[PDB]
Structure formats: structure tokens, C-alpha cells
Nucleic acid binder design. Sequence first.
DNA 1: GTAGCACGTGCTACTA
DNA 2: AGTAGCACGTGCTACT
Lengths: 19, 17, 28, 27
Amino acid sequence: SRAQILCKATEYIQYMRRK
Amino acid sequence: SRAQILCKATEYIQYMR
Amino acid sequence: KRAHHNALERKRRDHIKDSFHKLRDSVP
Amino acid sequence: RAHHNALERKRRDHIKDSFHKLRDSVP
DNA sequence: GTAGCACGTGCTACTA
DNA sequence: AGTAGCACGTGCTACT
Ligand SMILES: NC(=O)CN1C(=O)CCC1=O
Ligand SMILES: NC(=O)CN1C(=O)CCC1=O
């Protein structure tokens, strides 16, 4: 789902950018 | 952009991982 | 009737375009 | 027109392709 | 009865 | 001037 894909990458970028 | 954003994101993720 | 659907899809595109802008803001 | 339409069909497809490449990158 | 999708257009914007 | 890029309208399946 396009909404789900955007949310994922966005939530994984945010997490992984704070390590 | 939209396409710019997906490439940038895909490529940013590819490098951090 | 259907304009209700066209207006509702306008909110969905706005939602996707919102998520595009959010994802872009998280990547340098 | 058909030519215009034909390019956008192909441009959309490249956007979807770019959407599936991003879902496959993140765990 | 709404959500996700992809399509056919028309408009602005960028490319040789 | 052609090709990108975007948003709309709109007619689909499919889910919850
Ligand atoms: N913008 C955000 O980060 C919050 N959010 C959404 O809107 C969908 C998934 C998610 O985590
Ligand atoms: N599979 C890939 O080449 C990765 N990629 C591209 O080619 C453009 C930027 C992007 O996301």
C-alpha cells in the first residue's frame, strides 16, 4: 500500500537516523 | 519531485544499512 | 453523490502528498 | 494526445517501480 | 460506503 | 517543441 510504504521508510529513516 | 524523493530515500536507506 | 467521492479522494491525495513531504524531510 | 497519454502511463509505472524498490530496502 | 488504485487530461515547468 | 511533473475526475476491484 502506498500509504504503508511511505510510512515505513519514513519511520525507519527516523529511527535509524537516531542511532 | 516525487520520484526524486523515492530515490533519495531508497538510496539513503541503502547506505545507512 | 460522486462529487463527494472526488472530494474524498482529494483528501486522500493530500494525505499521500503529506506522507511524501514527511519522508523527504527525514532524508538529508 | 495518445502519445501524451502513453508517456504518462510509462511514467507512472516508473513511480510504482520506485515505490517497490523503497519497500524492499527497509527491513 | 469508504479506501486503494490507475487511467486520460490539461496545465505549468524544465530540457535540448 | 517535446518531455517531464502534478493534480484532478473518474470508473474499477476489494476490503473489512
Ligand atoms: N508522519 C508520521 O511520522 C506519523 N505516521 C503517519 O502519518 C503514518 C505512519 C506514521 O508513523
Ligand atoms: N535500483 C537503483 O538503481 C536505485 N536507484 C536508482 O537507480 C535511482 C535512485 C534509486 O533509487
